[PDB]
Coordinates of C-alpha atoms in Angstrom, one line a residue:
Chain Z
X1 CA 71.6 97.3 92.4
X2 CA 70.5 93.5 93.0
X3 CA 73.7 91.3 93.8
X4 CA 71.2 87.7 95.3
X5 CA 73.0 84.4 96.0
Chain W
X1 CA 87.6 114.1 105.5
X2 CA 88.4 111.1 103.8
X3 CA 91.9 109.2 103.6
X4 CA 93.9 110.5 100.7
X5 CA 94.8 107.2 100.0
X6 CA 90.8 106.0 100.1
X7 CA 88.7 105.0 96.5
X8 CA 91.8 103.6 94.6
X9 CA 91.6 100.0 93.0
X10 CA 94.4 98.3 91.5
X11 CA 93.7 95.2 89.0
X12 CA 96.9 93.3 88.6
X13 CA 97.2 90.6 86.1
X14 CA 99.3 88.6 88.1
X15 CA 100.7 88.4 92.0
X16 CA 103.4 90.1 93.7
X17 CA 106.9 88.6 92.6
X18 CA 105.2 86.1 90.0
X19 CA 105.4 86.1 86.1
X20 CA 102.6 87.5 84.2
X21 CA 102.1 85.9 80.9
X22 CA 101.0 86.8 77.4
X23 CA 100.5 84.6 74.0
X24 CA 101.8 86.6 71.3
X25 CA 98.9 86.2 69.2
X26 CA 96.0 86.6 71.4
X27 CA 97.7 89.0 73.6
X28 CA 97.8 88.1 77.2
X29 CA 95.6 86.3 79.6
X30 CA 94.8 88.6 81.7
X31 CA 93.6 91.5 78.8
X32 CA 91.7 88.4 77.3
X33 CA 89.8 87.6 80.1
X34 CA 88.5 91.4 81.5
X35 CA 87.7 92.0 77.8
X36 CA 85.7 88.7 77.3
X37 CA 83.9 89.4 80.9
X38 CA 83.4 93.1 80.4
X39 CA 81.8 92.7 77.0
X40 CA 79.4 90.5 78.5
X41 CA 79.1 91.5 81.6
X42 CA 80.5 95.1 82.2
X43 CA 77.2 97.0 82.4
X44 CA 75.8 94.8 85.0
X45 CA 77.9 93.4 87.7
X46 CA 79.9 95.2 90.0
X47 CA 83.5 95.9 89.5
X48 CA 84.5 93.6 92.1
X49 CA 82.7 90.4 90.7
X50 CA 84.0 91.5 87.3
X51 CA 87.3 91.2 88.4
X52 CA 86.8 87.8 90.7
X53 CA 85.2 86.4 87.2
X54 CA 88.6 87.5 85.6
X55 CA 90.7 86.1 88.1
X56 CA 88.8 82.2 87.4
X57 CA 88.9 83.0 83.8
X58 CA 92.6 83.5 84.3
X59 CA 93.1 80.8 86.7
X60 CA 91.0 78.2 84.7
X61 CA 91.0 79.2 80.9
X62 CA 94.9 79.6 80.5
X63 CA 98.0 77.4 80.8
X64 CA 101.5 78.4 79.2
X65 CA 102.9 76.8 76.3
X66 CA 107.2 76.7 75.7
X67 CA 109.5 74.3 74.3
X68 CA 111.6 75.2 77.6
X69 CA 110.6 72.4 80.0
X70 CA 111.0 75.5 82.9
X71 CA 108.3 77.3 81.4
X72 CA 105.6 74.7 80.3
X73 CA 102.6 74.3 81.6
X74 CA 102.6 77.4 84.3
X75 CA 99.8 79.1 85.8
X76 CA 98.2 82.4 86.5
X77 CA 95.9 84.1 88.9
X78 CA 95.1 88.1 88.8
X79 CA 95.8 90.4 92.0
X80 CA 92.8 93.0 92.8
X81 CA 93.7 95.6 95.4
X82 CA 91.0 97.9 96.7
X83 CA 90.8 101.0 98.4
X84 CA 87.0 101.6 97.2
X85 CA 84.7 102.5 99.8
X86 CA 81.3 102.0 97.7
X87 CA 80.1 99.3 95.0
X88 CA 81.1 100.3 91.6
X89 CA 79.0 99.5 88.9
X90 CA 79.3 101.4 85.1
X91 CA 76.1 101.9 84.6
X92 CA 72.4 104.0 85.7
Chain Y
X1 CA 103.9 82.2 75.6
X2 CA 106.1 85.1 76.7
X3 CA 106.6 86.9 80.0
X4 CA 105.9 90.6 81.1
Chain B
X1 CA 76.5 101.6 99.5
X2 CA 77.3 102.2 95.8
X3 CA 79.5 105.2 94.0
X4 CA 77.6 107.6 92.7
X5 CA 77.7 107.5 88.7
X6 CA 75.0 110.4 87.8
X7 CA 77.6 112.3 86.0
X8 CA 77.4 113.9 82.3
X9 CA 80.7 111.6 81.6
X10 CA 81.6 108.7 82.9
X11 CA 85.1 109.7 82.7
X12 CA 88.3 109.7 80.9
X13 CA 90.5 106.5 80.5
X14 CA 94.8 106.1 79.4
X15 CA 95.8 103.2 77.6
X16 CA 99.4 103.3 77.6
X17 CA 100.6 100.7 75.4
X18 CA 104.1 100.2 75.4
X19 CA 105.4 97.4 72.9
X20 CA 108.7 98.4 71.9
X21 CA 111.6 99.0 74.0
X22 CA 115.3 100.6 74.2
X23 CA 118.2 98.1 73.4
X24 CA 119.5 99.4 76.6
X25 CA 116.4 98.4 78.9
X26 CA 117.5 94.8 77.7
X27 CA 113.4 94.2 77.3
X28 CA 111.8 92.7 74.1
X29 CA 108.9 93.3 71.8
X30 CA 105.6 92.5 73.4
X31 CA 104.1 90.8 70.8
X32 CA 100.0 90.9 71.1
X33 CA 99.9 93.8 73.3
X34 CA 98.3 96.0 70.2
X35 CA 96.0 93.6 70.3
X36 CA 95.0 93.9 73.8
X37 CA 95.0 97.6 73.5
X38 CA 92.4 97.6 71.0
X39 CA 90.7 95.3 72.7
X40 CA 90.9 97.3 75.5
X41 CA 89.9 100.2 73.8
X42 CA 86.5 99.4 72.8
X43 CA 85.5 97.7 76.0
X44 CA 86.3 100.6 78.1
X45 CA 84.8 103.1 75.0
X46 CA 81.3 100.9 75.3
X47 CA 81.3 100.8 79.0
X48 CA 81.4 105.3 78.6
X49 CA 85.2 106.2 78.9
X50 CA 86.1 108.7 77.1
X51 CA 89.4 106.6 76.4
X52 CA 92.6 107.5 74.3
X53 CA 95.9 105.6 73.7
X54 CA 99.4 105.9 74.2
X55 CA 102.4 103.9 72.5
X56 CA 106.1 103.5 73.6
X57 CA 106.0 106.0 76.4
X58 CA 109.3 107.0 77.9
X59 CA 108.8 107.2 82.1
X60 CA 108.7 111.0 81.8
X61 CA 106.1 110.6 79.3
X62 CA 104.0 108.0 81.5
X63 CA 104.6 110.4 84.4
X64 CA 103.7 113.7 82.4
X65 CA 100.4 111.7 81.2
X66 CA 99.1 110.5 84.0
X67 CA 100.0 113.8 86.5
X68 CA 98.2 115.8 83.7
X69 CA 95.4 114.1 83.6
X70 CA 94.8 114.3 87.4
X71 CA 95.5 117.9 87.2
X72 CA 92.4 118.0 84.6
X73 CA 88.8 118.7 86.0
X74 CA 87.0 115.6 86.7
X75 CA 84.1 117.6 87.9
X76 CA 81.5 116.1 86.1
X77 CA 83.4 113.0 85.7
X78 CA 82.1 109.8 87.4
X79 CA 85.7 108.1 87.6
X80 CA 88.6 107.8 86.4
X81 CA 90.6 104.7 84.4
X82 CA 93.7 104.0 83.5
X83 CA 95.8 100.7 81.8
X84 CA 99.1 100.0 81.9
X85 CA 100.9 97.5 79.2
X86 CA 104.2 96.7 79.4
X87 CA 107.3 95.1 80.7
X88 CA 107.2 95.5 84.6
X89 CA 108.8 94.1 87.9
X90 CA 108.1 94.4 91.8
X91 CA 106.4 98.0 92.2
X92 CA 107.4 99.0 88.9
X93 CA 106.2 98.9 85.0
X94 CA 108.6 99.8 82.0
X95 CA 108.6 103.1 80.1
X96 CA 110.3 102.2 76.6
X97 CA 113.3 104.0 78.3
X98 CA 113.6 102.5 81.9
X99 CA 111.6 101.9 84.8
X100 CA 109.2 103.9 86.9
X101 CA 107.5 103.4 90.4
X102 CA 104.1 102.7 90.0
X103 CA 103.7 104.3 92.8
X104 CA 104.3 107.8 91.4
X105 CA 102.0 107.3 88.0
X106 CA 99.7 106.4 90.8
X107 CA 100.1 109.2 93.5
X108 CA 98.9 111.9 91.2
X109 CA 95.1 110.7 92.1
X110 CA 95.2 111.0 95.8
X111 CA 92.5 113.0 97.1
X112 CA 94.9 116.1 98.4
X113 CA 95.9 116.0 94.9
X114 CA 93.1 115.9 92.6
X115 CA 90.0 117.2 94.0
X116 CA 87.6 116.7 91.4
X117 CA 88.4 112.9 91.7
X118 CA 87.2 112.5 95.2
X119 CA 85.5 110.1 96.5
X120 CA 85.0 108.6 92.9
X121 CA 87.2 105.6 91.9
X122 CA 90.1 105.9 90.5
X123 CA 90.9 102.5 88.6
X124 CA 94.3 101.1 87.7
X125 CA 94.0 98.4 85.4
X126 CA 98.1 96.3 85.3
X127 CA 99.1 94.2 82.8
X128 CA 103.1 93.5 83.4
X129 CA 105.5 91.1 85.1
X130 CA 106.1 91.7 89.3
X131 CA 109.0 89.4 89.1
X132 CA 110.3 86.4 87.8
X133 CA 108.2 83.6 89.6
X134 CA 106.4 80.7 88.0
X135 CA 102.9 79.4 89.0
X136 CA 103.3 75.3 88.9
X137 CA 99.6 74.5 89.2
X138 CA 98.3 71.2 91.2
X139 CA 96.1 68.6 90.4
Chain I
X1 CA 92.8 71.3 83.9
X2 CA 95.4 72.8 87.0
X3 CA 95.0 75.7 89.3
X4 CA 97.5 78.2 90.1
X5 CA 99.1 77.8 93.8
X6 CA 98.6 81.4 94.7
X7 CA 94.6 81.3 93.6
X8 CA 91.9 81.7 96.2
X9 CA 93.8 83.5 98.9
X10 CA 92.3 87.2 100.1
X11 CA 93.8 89.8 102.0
X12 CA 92.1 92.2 104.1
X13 CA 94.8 94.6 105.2
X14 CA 93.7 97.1 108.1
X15 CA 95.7 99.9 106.4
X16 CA 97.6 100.4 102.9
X17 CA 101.4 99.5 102.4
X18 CA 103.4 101.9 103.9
X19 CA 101.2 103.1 106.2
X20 CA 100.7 103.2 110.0
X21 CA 97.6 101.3 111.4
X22 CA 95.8 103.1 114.2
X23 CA 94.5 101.5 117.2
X24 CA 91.9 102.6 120.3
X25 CA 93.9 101.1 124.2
X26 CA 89.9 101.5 124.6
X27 CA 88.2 100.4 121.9
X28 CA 90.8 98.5 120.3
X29 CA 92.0 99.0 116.3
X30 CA 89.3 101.1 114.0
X31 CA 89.6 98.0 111.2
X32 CA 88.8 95.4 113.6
X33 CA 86.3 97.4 115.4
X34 CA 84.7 98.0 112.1
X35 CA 84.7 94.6 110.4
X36 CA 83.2 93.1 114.0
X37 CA 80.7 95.7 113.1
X38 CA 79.7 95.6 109.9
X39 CA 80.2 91.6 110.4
X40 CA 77.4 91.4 113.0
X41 CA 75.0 93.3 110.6
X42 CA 76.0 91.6 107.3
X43 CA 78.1 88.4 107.7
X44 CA 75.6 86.2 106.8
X45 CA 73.9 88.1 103.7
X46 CA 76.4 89.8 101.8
X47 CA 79.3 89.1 99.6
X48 CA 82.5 89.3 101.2
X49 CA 83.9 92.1 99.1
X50 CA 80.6 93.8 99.9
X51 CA 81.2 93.1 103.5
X52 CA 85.0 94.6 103.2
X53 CA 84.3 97.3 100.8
X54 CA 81.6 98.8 103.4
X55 CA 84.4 98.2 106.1
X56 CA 87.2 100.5 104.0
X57 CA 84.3 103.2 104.0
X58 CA 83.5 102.9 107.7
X59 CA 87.4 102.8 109.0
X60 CA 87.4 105.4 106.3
X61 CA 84.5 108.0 107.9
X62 CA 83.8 107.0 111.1
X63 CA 87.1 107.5 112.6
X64 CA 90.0 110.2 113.4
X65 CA 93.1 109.9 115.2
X66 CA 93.3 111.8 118.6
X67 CA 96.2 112.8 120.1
X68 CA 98.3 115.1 122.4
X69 CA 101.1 115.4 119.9
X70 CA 99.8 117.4 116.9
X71 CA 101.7 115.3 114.4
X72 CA 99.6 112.3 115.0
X73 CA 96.4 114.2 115.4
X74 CA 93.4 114.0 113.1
X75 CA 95.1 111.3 110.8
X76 CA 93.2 109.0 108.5
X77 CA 92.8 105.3 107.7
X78 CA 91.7 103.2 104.7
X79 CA 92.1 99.6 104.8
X80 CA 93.2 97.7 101.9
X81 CA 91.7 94.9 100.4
X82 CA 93.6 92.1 98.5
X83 CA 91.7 89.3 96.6
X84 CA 92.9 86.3 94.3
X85 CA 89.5 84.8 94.9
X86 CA 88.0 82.8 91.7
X87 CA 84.3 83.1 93.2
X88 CA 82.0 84.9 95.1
X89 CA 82.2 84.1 98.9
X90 CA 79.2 84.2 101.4
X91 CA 79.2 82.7 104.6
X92 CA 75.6 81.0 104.4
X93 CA 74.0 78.5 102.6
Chain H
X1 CA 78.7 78.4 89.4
X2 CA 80.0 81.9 90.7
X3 CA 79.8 81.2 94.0
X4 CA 82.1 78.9 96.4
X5 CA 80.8 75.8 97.0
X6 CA 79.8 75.8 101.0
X7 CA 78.4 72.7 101.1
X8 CA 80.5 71.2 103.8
X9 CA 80.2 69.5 107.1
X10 CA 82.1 73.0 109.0
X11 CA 82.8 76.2 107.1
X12 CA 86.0 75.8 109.1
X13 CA 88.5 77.0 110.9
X14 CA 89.6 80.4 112.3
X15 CA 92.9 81.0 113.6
X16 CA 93.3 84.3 115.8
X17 CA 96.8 85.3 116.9
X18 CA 97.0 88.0 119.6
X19 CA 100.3 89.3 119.6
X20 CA 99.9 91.8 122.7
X21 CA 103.4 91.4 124.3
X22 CA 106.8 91.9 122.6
X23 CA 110.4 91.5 124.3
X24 CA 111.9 94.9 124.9
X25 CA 114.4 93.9 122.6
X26 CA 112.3 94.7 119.6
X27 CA 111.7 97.8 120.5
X28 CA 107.7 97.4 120.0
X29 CA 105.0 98.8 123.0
X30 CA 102.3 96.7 124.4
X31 CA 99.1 96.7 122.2
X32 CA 96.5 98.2 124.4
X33 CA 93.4 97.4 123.3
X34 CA 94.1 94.1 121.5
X35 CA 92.8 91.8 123.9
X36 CA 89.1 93.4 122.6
X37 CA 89.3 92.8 119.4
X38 CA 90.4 89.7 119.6
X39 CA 86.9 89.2 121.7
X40 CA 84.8 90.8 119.1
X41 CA 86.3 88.7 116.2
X42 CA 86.5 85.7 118.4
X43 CA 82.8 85.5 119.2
X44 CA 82.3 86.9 115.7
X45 CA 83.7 84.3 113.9
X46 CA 82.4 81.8 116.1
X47 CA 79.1 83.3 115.0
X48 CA 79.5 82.5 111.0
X49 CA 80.2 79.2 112.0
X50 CA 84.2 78.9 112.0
X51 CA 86.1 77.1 114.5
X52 CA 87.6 80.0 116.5
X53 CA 91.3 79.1 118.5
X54 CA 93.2 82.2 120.0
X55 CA 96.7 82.1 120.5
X56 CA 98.6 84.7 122.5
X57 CA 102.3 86.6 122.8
X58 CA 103.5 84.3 120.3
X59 CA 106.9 83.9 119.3
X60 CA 107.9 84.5 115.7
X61 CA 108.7 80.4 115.3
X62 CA 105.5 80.1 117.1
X63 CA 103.6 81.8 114.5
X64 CA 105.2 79.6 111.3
X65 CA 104.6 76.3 113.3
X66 CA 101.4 77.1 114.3
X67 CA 100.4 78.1 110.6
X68 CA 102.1 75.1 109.2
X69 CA 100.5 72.1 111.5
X70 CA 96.9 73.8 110.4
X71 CA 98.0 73.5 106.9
X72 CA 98.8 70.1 107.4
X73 CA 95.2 69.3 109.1
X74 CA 92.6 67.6 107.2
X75 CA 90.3 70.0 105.4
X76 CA 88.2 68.4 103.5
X77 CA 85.4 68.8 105.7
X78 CA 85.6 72.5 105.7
X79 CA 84.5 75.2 103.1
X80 CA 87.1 77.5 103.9
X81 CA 90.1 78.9 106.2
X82 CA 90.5 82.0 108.1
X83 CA 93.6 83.5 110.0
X84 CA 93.3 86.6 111.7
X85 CA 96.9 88.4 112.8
X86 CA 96.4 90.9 115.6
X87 CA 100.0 92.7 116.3
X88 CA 102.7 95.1 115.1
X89 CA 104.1 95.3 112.1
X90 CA 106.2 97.2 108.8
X91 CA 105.7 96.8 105.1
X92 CA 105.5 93.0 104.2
X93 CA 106.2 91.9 107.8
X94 CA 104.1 91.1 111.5
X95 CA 105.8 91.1 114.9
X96 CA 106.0 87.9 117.2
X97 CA 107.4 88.7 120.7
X98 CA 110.3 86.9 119.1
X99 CA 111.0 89.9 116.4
X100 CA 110.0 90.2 112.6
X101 CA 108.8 87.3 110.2
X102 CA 107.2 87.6 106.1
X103 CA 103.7 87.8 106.0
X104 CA 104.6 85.5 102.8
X105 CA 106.1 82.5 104.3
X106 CA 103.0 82.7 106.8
X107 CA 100.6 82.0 104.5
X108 CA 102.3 80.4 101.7
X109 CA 102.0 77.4 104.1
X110 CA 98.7 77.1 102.5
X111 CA 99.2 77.8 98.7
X112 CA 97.5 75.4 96.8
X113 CA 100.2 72.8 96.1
X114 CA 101.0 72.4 99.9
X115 CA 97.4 72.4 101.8
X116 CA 95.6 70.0 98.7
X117 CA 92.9 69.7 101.3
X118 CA 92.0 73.8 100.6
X119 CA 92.7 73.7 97.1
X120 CA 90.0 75.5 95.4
X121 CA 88.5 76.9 98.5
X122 CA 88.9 80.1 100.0
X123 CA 91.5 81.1 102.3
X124 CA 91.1 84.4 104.5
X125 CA 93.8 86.7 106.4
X126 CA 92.6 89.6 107.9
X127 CA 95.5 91.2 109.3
X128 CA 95.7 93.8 111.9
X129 CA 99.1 95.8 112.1
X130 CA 101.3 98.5 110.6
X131 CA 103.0 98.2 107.2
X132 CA 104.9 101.0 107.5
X133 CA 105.5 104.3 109.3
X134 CA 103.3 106.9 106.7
X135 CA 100.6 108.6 107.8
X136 CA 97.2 109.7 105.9
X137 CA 96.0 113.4 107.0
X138 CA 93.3 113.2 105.2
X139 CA 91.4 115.5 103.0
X140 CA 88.2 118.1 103.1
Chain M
X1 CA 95.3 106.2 119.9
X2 CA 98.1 104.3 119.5
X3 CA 100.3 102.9 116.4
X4 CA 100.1 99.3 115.0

């Protein structure tokens, strides 16, 4: 999955 | 082989040796808050930033009411334990 | 409030 | 880097919801706990577990439930979930007839003891008391 | 409009309660060998509980317990992870 | 946001105790290997950006003082706090050469009515040592 | 390896 700051 | 003790994750809704409160009529804080996150964000964030939402939503969005002076105004924060070894997400 |  | 969840279930989930207590446990009605257990039960039913509720368990009950439940097949199970409501203290949650370690509800899942739950989580969800200290806040 | 006292704090625990922790006289305890590790490769892009969670699984697989006395040989670890954090913590911008 | 704020002038400081030595008293064997690890998380740490200080063999009292005066720094120039305990220990507890102290009263030095200066920011322990005497055999 |  996409996990972004 | 893999540690029996390995992929276990324990969500408390309070710390070790604390209190853990509840209202009566909206059931307690911690239930509240994973149900209000999950329902919004359950199918896409993983299980640990579920839970760290839950703990702020616990921290933040909750403060005890009593006429007992002793017991007015107290706090809450969730204890997560884990023992996972991958990201968990409910989902795909 | 009450305690668990 | 994430558990895999291509399963045909996403796996089964205990609510044990335990409101009501023996005179001699000294405990009290937990008022609003059938509210979280509803709640409960249609977050965890949307999110794909296969959940089902339990009221006023005794400890044997809790024990019997959850030791079952590991000796079920979880083969084509993604996880595994399980709440606990109730009164509780230090290591240990109230059945409507005592205490029990929570270690022992818990044991059940270890991976020399349930098989078809390894390497999948196994999720333990607590709402109850670990003692009798109170969080003051600041600022 | 407080916060609770005990908010914000996290534990990473090289091993589970009750449990021994190993260690290497060589190469020095499999949890801190493994967070240095996965540290070096990740602790400036990931989420701590990312950077943790891949440390439980690398204690976890990558290491075994040797020794002469066959009670203490092959043995496992798993770390355990503690959090009463409120946000999401990276060590970058 | 979701995220903690790390907007600060340092991200902070990081406290590593190497507990290698304990008086034969208590029964505990000399950590082989310790001294290593405390060199990989040293330069580590020192890497993200966190003030690393070592401290070695300490006592138990050593430990609580040491832990109390950093709670009592200034911190508002920091985004965060670290402590990393390198030595033996049993369930709830971590070995000074001294003997046995709470993990509890070691880090409740910095709860967040008595370190104000780290309320609302994130404060680490990574903890190397035993809790405990069980041992996991595995599986598969 | 040794015990901690």
């Amino acid at each position: 999955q996409g996990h972004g700051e | 082989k893999i540690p029996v003790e390995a992929d276990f994750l324990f969500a408390y809704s309070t710390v070790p040796g604390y209190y853990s409160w509840r209202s009566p009529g909206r059931g307690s804080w911690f239930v509240q808050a994973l149900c209000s996150i999950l329902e919004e964000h359950g199918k896409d964030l993983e299980i640990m930033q579920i839970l760290t939402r839950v703990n702020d939503r616990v921290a933040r969005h909750f403060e005890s009411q009593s006429d007992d002076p002793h017991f007015h105004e107290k706090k809450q924060i969730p204890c997560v334990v884990s023992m996972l070894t991958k990201e968990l997400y409910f989902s795909q | 409030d009450n305690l668990x | 880097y994430q558990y895999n969840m291509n399963f045909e279930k996403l796996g089964k989930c205990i609510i044990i919801n335990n409101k009501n207590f023996d005179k001699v446990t000294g405990m009290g009605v937990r008022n609003g706990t059938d509210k979280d257990a509803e709640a409960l039960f249609k977050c965890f039913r949307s999110l794909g577990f296969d959940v089902i509720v339990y009221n006023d368990c005794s400890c044997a009950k809790m024990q019997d439930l959850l030791k079952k439940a590991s000796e079920e097949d979880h083969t084509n199970a993604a996880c595994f979930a399980c709440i606990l409501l109730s009164h509780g203290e230090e290591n240990v949650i109230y059945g409507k007839d005592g205490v029990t370690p929570i270690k022992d509800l818990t044991a059940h899942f270890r991976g020399d003891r349930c098989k078809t739950l390894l390497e999948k989580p196994k999720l333990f969800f607590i709402q109850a008391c670990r003692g009798t200290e109170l969080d003051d806040g600041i600022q």
